[PDB]
């Protein structure tokens with residue numbers, strides 16, 4: 780698949796107010812794999828889109844009140860059925876990493892692209908998600924060659940704060956699909 784001005788040519792575009800500029804409009808060089816599910820352990824809601832666009836109803840589930848105060852986003856979500864949703868163009872800074880460090884460099888939001896897999900640390904991701912994650916990643920690598928050398932989990936850049944994408948994320952299968 781192709782990239783069009785920072786947007787996946789093939790994705791549902793859900794443009795989020797939750798983004799700003801990368802410092803000096805630097806090119807991203809790191810892919811951070813995440814997972815997300817809202818409410819925890821459940822799939823298919825509107826809640827992920829709502830969280831990443833700042834419109835979530837704090838009252839729709841006991842879990843939501845707590846994260847309503849957050850200001851977060853990711854570049855893309857890949858749903859259980861493989862559907863790709865993009866909230867932030869890749870050249871812009873999404874708010875997905877939080878306090879983090881990679882190879883000595885902090886504030887990974889600055890130089891990373893965040894892709895969220897709908898799922899949990901302990902449940903297998905779907906065949907569609909691996910296929911689609913790979914297609915997106917291959918596209919990103921074409922545009923930003925350094926990503927080929929720099930793919931990581933949120934848990935690796937924020938250890939003992941974050942666990943996503945967890946043991947369930949099969950790095951071997953994923954890497955085999957990439958470039």
Ligand SMILES: C[C@H](N)C(=O)N[C@H](CCC(=O)N[C@@H](CCC[C@@H](N)C(=O)O)C(=O)O)C(=O)O
Pocket residue numbers: 799813850851852853873874875876877878888937941
């Ligand atoms: C969606 C993502 N996976 C997420 O929820 N994780 C959050 C990611 C949170 C995150 O990036 N905050 C940013 C800033 C948040 C908003 C701020 N720029 C603004 O203008 O309002 C940071 O620390 O620079 C986590 O790890 O704490």
Ligand SMILES: CC(=O)N[C@H]1[C@@H]2OC[C@@H](O2)[C@@H](O)[C@@H]1O[C@@H](C)C(=O)O
Pocket residue numbers: 813814815816817830846851875895933941943
């Ligand atoms: C424990 C945690 O920090 N919060 C979960 C929760 O679910 C939605 C929102 O709040 C998201 O920030 C999140 O994280 C994970 C798994 C992630 O960063 O991918």
Ligand SMILES: [Zn+2]
Pocket residue numbers: 812813814875933934941943
């Ligand atoms: Zn994460």
